[PDB]
């Protein structure tokens with residue numbers, strides 16, 4: 001399959017709204033949305049191209065539904081999969097743990113064989129520390145709907161263009 005499986009979690013709905021934007025931005029290239037509150041870890045097996053969305057909560061912690069699946073990721077093999085990440089977070093209120101959730105998820109998924117695509121520049125954010133940092137870039141798209149909502153659509157448009165190349169669409 002060349003459809004993209006987008007698996008997101010949300011507590012206050014912001015990550016879901018951004019997920020819908022990414023689906024729209026992919027245009028006629030199909031992206032299928034999956035809320036992880038309704039998923040089983042084995043649903044991840046169904047795609048070769050995955051997009052993982054998660055907000056960071058409670059000072060550096062996973063969104064609740066994602067924590068449930070996280071615990072079972074050693075039950076899946078991500079070899080042969082290309083995986084991109086996005087997150088929502090607040091760089092002003094949580095400057096020391098900005099986007100940690102996607103960094104925790106990517107470290108596990110890459111341990112299990114997934115190959116990360118979609119690295120994103122840190123220019124234009126004001127933060128101190130992040131578990132999503134990888135040699136000076138973020139592991140994936142960092143969105144901030146609390147402080148930088150006006151930038152979200154442009155950031156998504158750019159990242160989707162990069163993803164279509166990295167997924168070979």
Ligand SMILES: Cc1cc2nc3c(=O)[nH]c(=O)nc-3n(C[C@H](O)[C@H](O)[C@H](O)COP(=O)(O)O)c2cc1C
Nearest residue numbers: 010011012013014015055059060088089090098099
């Ligand atoms: C109590 C609380 C703690 C938060 N902790 C973090 C954090 O550690 N890191 C961060 O980047 N954002 C943090 N956020 C910001 C949320 O990730 C952000 O509002 C996000 O858009 C929520 O996504 P959701 O609506 O999909 O759940 C926190 C927000 C609140 C209210």
